């Protein structure tokens, strides 16, 4: 009965794979802090929902600071950021 209640409490919120996906807490001036991306590496490229690219520079305990390779107007707070799995390369 209790486990079903806590399952209902968890299911009241959407399911997010925070290891490889992140939500933008704040986007601005080409630098976005995201909640999530638990398996991100330093200097690792990420992709935003709008198709832009970013680089995970700051690995903070609460958020991840990502420098955005483009204009920040296409990124909204709460957008989906996913890891590319590799360090930045050309």
């Amino acid at each position: 009965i209790s486990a079903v209640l806590e399952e209902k409490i968890l299911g009241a919120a959407p399911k997010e794979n925070l290891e490889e996906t992140g939500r933008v807490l704040s986007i601005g001036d080409g630098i976005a802090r995201v909640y999530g991306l638990k398996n991100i590496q330093a200097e690792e490229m990420v992709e935003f929902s709008s198709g832009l690219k970013g680089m995970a520079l700051n690995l903070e305990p609460d958020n991840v600071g990502i420098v955005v390779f483009g204009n920040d107007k296409h990124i909204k707070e709460g957008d989906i950021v996913k890891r590319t799995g590799a360090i930045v390369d050309v």
Binding site: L25, S26, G28, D29, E77
Partner: peptide, 10 residues
């Protein structure tokens, strides 16, 4: 009074 959003504070 028009306010321009400079940053998101969360």
């Amino acid at each position: 009074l028009i306010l321009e959003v400079a940053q998101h504070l969360g």
